[PDB]
């Protein structure tokens, strides 16, 4: 079986630097075209760059051409890809995927660049200018809603909780760096005691607010 | 580069239907080219390649064609497990370029937002950004907008699990001063089921 | 399913192919059957004549032709060509003798190649370029220069880009101290009508005192990214100039090629190992 | 060159 282990994503300031290692089992980096992809938060793939090892040819994307520089260590069965001068922008969950150069019938076909038919798994790469903060939990009172407004926090995930008809209000990134959100719930107008319990795991922030 | 464009923006459709999506590429492309399935936040799932041809493991449902330079994605039976994003790319080329996505949704009998708002807490007014909330929650299709009457940041919910729904908050943040020089706030939820734009307000 | 098509400026002759790599399985190769569509007013009485040939160049010592005569007359994938075109669709049908000279050349052409020329005349064009090529179907060295050097490969059939492990074991009993150790590849390319290349050097810094033992793998891959700028490097046979890989190792009149890798003790003690390297029936 | 069509 083949498969593709991506590792090395975690925080970065912008104008930082990263290494995403993508460890290939089943095959060689040798015979296959290796793409490093990536998706930003809520878009569309872009591919990123693209190697083979064998000819020692590279392809970058004109938006990462220069910022990122990709290479290969056949010794480990590994495929390099070094992000420098990272910004806002480069956040995204990176992918690593591959094109085996077999199957023209003999040989490499060194002129296909064909469809990537195995993907890694993706890894969360972060650019913020900023440090970790823990959630500001403000009550939203008035079926009658009600809700935990839960403001300014670094970095996913919050997970709050109700002591049916919870909607988490997926987090956007304000302007400031930080994530907001909202978490309501809609309860009868004639039983209108409700207890709002935000967590923040990565600053171990733990809140709890009485709506009524 | 080669501009992958894709339409439609994005399509509904409930069990059993056929959906159609069309990757029309700027320049000419010869066969190459590949469907991902993208599903919600996993790593896209190679559909098609060759531009006709189902790789190894997909379901025969799926099919690819070609009549030029515009490639066609069909699906005989649209099954419920086939609701993700579907993104076309040449391969032709470098750097390889995808489409922009074609979320299939699912469908239901039009719904209104059922309508909520909320004004900022006093815990918040201390701290200094008051942050109003209308939460316009159990409203179909995506399609709805949302203007805020005295800086909005809509925080769109995916589609409810329960009944194909969609609930939808707004996040009005203002400064304590300025949010206190006004008295009067009002979210109005314009939505096409919606014979008219459903205001909700309060006071300071 | 797909068939490589090939006409003339004119385009009254066509040929019709249905594999442009011939397998050489070593007792049959993969004949070479086509399909040659004619139109009658542009042949008349003059004959349709269909040729294969194995030049060798480096000088074109065409080691074998042979012109099989489309028409007048004299396989399914040919009936089903044939069914497409009607009766003005002829034949054709090579066989390549198993001793030839596989598909090779170098890197700046030079080397071997197959073809199929169809012409028309009334006594003996497209040009196919068609190539000859093969599939992929335990080394131990030691030396008592006392400096006891012992190497061994895992396994003596490598799949090109796949990468070779060597197994070092140096028991230096001497008072000579070494310097370095290079597990280097070297490919020998004889033209026939033999020159040493090396291709990957793994030197190491690796020094092992008197009476002493030194044992650890090596990994060392052969790769044509840094080959590009050897003059005379055997590369595997390009169609229409494709960029190809490194020349497989014949299995035995052209081109021979050998590949071996070389144990070398910088102090000098060394061995050598031959492995194979073809690309694996996919 | 070589074109390729379908069978």
Same mark, same amino acid.
């Given at each position: 079986?083949?498969?593709?282990?991506?590792?090395?994503?975690?925080?970065?300031?912008?104008?930082?630097?990263?290494?995403?290692?993508?460890?290939?089992?089943?095959?060689?980096?040798?015979?296959?075209?290796?793409?490093?992809?990536?998706?930003?938060?809520?878009?569309?793939?872009?591919?990123?760059?693209?190697?083979?090892?064998?000819?020692?040819?590279?392809?970058?994307?004109?938006?990462?051409?220069?910022?990122?520089?990709?290479?290969?260590?056949?010794?480990?069965?590994?495929?390099?890809?070094?992000?420098?001068?990272?910004?806002?922008?480069?956040?995204?969950?990176?992918?690593?995927?591959?094109?085996?150069?077999? !199957?023209?019938?003999?040989?490499?076909?060194?002129?296909?660049?064909?469809?990537?038919?195995?993907?890694?798994?993706?890894?969360?790469?972060?650019?913020?200018?900023?440090?970790?903060?823990?959630?500001?939990?403000?009550?939203?009172?008035?079926?009658?809603?009600?809700?935990?407004?839960?403001?300014?926090?670094?970095?996913?995930?919050?997970?709050?909780?109700?002591?049916?008809?919870?909607?988490?209000?997926?987090?956007?990134?304000?302007?400031?760096?930080?994530?907001?959100?909202?978490?309501?719930?809609?309860?009868?107008?004639?039983?209108?005691?409700?207890?709002?319990?935000?967590? !923040?795991?990565?600053?171990?922030?733990?809140?709890?607010?009485?709506?009524? | 580069?080669?501009?992958?464009?894709?339409?439609?923006?994005?399509?509904?459709?409930?069990?059993?239907?056929?959906?159609?999506?069309?990757?029309?590429?700027?320049?000419?492309?010869?066969?190459?080219?590949?469907?991902?399935?993208?599903?919600?936040?996993?790593?896209?799932?190679?559909?098609?390649?060759?531009?006709?041809?189902?790789?190894?493991?997909?379901?025969?449902?799926?099919?690819?064609?070609?009549?030029?330079?515009?490639?066609?994605?069909?699906?005989?039976?649209?099954?419920?497990?086939?609701?993700?994003?579907?993104?076309?790319?040449?391969?032709? =080329?470098?750097?390889?370029?995808?489409?922009?996505?074609?979320?299939?949704?699912?469908?239901?009998?039009?719904?209104?937002?059922?309508?909520?708002?909320?004004?900022?807490?006093?815990?918040?007014?201390?701290?200094?950004?008051?942050?109003?909330?209308?939460?316009?929650?159990?409203?179909?299709?995506?399609?709805?907008?949302?203007?805020?009457?005295?800086?909005?940041?809509?925080?769109?919910?995916?589609?409810?699990?329960?009944?194909?729904?969609?609930?939808?908050?707004?996040?009005?943040?203002?400064?304590?001063?300025? =949010?206190?020089?006004?008295?009067?706030?009002?979210?109005?939820?314009?939505?096409?089921?919606?014979?008219?734009?459903?205001?909700?307000?309060?006071?300071? | 399913?797909?068939?490589?098509?090939?006409? /003339?400026?004119?385009?009254?002759?066509?040929?019709?192919?249905?594999?442009?790599?011939?397998?050489?399985?070593?007792?049959?190769?993969?004949?070479?059957?086509?399909?040659?569509?004619?139109?009658?007013?542009?042949?008349?009485?003059?004959?349709?004549?269909?040729?294969?040939?194995?030049?060798?160049?480096?000088?074109?010592?065409?080691?074998?032709?042979?012109?099989?005569?489309?028409?007048? $007359?004299?396989?399914?994938?040919?009936?089903?060509?044939?069914?497409?075109?009607?009766?003005?669709?002829?034949?054709?049908?090579?066989?390549?003798?198993?001793?030839?000279?596989?598909?090779?050349?170098?890197?700046?052409?030079?080397?071997?190649?197959?073809?199929?020329?169809?012409?028309?005349?009334?006594?003996?064009?497209?040009?196919?370029?068609?190539?000859?090529?093969?599939?992929?179907?335990? $080394?131990?060295?030691?030396?008592?220069?006392?400096?006891?050097?012992?190497?061994?490969?895992?396994?003596?059939?490598?799949?090109?880009?796949?990468?070779?492990?060597?197994?070092?074991?140096?028991?230096?009993?001497?008072?000579?101290?070494?310097?370095?150790?290079?597990?280097?590849?070297?490919?020998?390319?004889?033209?026939?009508?033999?020159?040493?290349? $090396?291709?990957?050097?793994?030197?190491?810094?690796?020094?092992?005192?008197?009476?002493?033992?030194?044992?650890?793998?090596?990994?060392?891959?052969?790769?044509?990214?840094?080959?590009?700028?050897?003059?005379?490097?055997?590369?595997?046979?390009?169609?229409?100039?494709?960029?190809?890989?490194?020349?497989? /190792?014949?299995?035995?009149?052209?081109?021979?090629?050998?590949?071996?890798?070389?144990?070398?003790?910088?102090?000098?003690?060394?061995?050598?190992?031959?492995?194979?390297?073809?690309?694996?029936?996919? | 060159?070589?074109?390729?069509?379908?069978?």
């Amino acid at each position: 079986e083949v498969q593709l282990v991506e590792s090395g994503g975690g925080l970065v300031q912008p104008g930082g630097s990263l290494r995403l290692s993508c460890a290939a089992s089943g095959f060689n980096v040798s015979s296959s075209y290796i793409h490093w992809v990536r998706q930003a938060p809520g878009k569309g793939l872009e591919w990123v760059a693209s190697i083979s090892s064998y000819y020692g040819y590279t392809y970058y994307a004109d938006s990462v051409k220069g910022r990122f520089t990709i290479s290969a260590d056949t010794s480990k069965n590994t495929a390099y890809l070094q992000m420098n001068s990272l910004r806002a922008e480069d956040t995204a969950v990176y992918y690593c995927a591959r094109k085996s150069m077999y !199957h023209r019938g003999w040989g490499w076909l060194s002129w296909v660049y064909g469809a990537m038919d195995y993907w890694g798994q993706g890894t969360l790469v972060t650019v913020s200018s900023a440090s970790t903060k823990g959630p500001s939990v403000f009550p939203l009172a008035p079926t009658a809603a009600l809700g935990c407004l839960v403001k300014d926090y670094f970095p996913e995930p919050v997970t709050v909780s109700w002591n049916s008809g919870v909607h988490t209000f997926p987090a956007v990134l304000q302007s400031s760096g930080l994530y907001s959100l909202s978490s309501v719930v809609t309860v009868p107008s004639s039983s209108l005691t409700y207890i709002c319990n935000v967590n !923040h795991k990565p600053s171990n922030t733990k809140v709890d607010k009485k709506v009524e | 580069d080669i501009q992958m464009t894709q339409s439609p923006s994005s399509l509904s459709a409930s069990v059993g239907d056929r959906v159609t999506i069309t990757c029309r590429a700027s320049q000419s492309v010869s066969s190459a080219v590949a469907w991902y399935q993208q599903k919600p936040g996993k790593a896209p799932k190679l559909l098609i390649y060759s531009a006709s041809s189902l790789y190894s493991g997909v379901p025969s449902r799926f099919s690819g064609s070609r009549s030029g330079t515009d490639f066609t994605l069909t699906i005989s039976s649209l099954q419920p497990e086939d609701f993700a994003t579907y993104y076309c790319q040449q391969s032709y =080329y470098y750097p390889i370029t995808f489409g922009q996505g074609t979320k299939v949704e699912i469908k239901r009998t039009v719904a209104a937002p059922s309508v909520f708002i909320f004004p900022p807490s006093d815990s918040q007014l201390k701290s200094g950004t008051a942050s109003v909330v209308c939460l316009l929650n159990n409203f179909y299709p995506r399609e709805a907008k949302v203007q805020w009457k005295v800086n909005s940041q809509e925080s769109v919910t995916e589609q409810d699990s329960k009944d194909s729904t969609y609930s939808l908050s707004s996040t009005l943040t203002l400064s304590k001063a300025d =949010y206190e020089k006004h008295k009067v706030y009002a979210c109005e939820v314009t939505h096409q089921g919606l014979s008219s734009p459903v205001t909700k307000s309060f006071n300071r | 399913t797909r068939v490589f098509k090939k006409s /003339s400026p004119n385009c009254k002759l066509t040929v019709y192919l249905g594999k442009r790599d011939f397998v050489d399985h070593l007792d049959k190769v993969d004949p070479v059957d086509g399909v040659v569509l004619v139109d009658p007013d542009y042949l008349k009485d003059r004959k349709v004549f269909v040729t294969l040939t194995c030049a060798f160049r480096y000088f074109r010592k065409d080691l074998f032709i042979a012109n099989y005569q489309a028409f007048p $007359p004299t396989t399914r994938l040919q009936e089903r060509l044939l069914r497409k075109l009607g009766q003005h669709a002829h034949p054709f049908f090579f066989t390549i003798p198993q001793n030839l000279p596989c598909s090779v050349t170098l890197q700046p052409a030079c080397g071997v190649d197959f073809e199929i020329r169809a012409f028309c005349a009334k006594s003996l064009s497209v040009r196919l370029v068609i190539r000859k090529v093969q599939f992929a179907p335990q $080394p131990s060295a030691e030396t008592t220069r006392s400096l006891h050097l012992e190497a061994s490969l895992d396994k003596e059939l490598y799949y090109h880009g796949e990468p070779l492990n060597v197994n070092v074991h140096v028991t230096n009993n001497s008072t000579k101290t070494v310097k370095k150790i290079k597990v280097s590849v070297r490919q020998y390319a004889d033209i026939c009508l033999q020159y040493k290349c $090396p291709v990957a050097q793994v030197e190491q810094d690796d020094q092992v005192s008197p009476s002493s033992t030194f044992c650890k793998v090596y990994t060392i891959t052969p790769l044509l990214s840094n080959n590009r700028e050897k003059r005379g490097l055997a590369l595997d046979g390009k169609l229409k100039h494709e960029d190809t890989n490194l020349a497989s /190792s014949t299995i035995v009149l052209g081109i021979l090629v050998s590949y071996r890798v070389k144990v070398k003790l910088v102090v000098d003690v060394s061995v050598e190992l031959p492995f194979v390297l073809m690309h694996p029936k996919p | 060159k070589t074109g390729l069509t379908k069978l």
